Amino acid sequence: SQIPRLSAINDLHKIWPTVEEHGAAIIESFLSLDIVRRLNEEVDPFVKIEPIPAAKTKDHPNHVLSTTTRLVNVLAPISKAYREDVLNSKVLHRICSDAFHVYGDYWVLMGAVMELAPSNPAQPLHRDMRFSHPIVEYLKPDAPATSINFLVALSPFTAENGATHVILGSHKWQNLSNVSMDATVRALMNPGDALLITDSTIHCGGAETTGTETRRLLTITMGISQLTPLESNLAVPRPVIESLTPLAQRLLGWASQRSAAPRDIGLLTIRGNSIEKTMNLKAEQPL
């Protein structure tokens, strides 16, 4: 059976329950085509200048991604559409608050644009977070998901051009001897549609088989504020940060965070006060 498809408008309350059951759901029109167009236009140049993932120039090379893959993260300074429209997505925030209520506050572990070159091979079937957060492998099997991944199509996802594979129900698997491409279904998606998976969903990028098509996606890993992001916004200029909403500032680690503990003592606090109170960080200041 196929990946459940849900409306961002009509089925909002059904999205997280669907992922919790099946380990994957397609959110049709997660981003409007206007937001996709502005996002694509803004990141275009940064994708073109991005070297190979394991470039000898990098002191944090990515040895896992194929040499044809280009990944651009820390999108806040690059993209007005990302910092304003995506970081304040009503649909994203409803799903994340549904997903992470047991733990507390959530933030962006990584927002990245990925462009796959023609003839990009299929990724091995995997769970995310295993190259950055070894801790997640030590969580009890039934522990609520500590991160989820919105794979947003920025170009068409087809069977031919390497649309994502998922194994439905694999987020609940402990024994992995049944892991095979035989067990997968595809995320066929229009630009702005999003495939939502958990950190336990077994999945992979598909094989690009046309030899002509370039596939692009926005991957948003949302995780509990108790886990360290893969990416830093420490070098984002304060003018850009102060142009954001307080919620967007929190998602980029420019605010203190709270756990769901009844008498929570907080994260990234400064002698009982928040980052934002201490540094007198203003919000929604046009540049």
- 206's enclosing H/E stretch is none
Q: Which is nearer to a copy of itself, 63 or 90 (CB)?
A: 63
Q: Does 232 bind a copy of itself (CB under 8 A)?
A: yes
Among 184, 221, 233, 249, binds ligand CO0 (CB under 6 A): 221
User: Of 7, 183, 222, nearest to 99 (Cα)?
Assistant: 222
To a copy of itself, the closest distance from the beta carbon of 202 in angstroms equals 18
Q: Does 65 bind Cl ion (CB under 5 A)?
A: yes
> Would you state the structure tokens that stand for residue 78, as one six-digit string?
């690059």
Could you tell which of Br ion, Cl ion, a copy of itself, none binds residue 69, using a CB distance below 5 to 8 A set by kind?
Cl ion
Helix axes 90-100, 12-22, angle to 10 degrees: 50
**Burial track 60-83 (b if 16+ CB lie within 10 A, e otherwise):** eeeeebbebbbebbbbbebbebbb
Among 21, 29, 37, 66, binds Cl ion (CB under 5 A): 66
Give the three-state DSSP class for 250: helix
165 is in an annotated binding site: no
First to last CA, the chain: 49
To ligand CO0, the closest distance from the beta carbon of 14 in angstroms equals 25
Q: Does 131 bind a copy of itself (CB under 8 A)?
A: yes
- 197's enclosing H/E stretch is strand 194-198
Q: Does 194 bind ligand CO0 (CB under 6 A)?
A: no
CB-side neighbour CA atoms (13 Å) of 229: 22
Among 34, 101, 131, 159, binds ligand CO0 (CB under 6 A): 131
To a copy of itself, the closest distance from the beta carbon of 227 in angstroms equals 6
Place of tokens 């992470």: 100
Interface with ligand CO0 in residues 264-283 (CB under 6 A): 265
Q: Does 233 bind Cl ion (CB under 5 A)?
A: no
171 is in an annotated binding site: no
126 is in an annotated binding site: yes
Residue 37 class from Cβ within 10 Å (0-12 exposed, 13-18 middle, 19+ buried)? Answer: middle
Q: Does 268 bind a copy of itself (CB under 8 A)?
A: yes
**Burial track 224-256 (b if 16+ CB lie within 10 A, e otherwise):** bbbbebbbebeebeeebbbbbeeebbbbbbbbb
Kindly list the distances between the CA atom of residue 150 and the CA atoms of 72, 155, 198, 217, in Å, as whole numbers in the listed order: 16, 15, 9, 10
List residues binding Ni ion (CB under 5 A): 128
List residues binding a copy of itself (CB under 8 A): 50-51, 53, 55, 58-64, 71-74, 102-104, 130-135, 138-140, 143-144, 146, 224-232, 234-235, 254, 256-257, 259-261, 263-275, 277-279
List residues binding Cl ion (CB under 5 A): 65-66, 69
List residues binding ligand CO0 (CB under 6 A): 62, 64-65, 110, 112, 123-124, 126, 128-131, 219, 221, 265
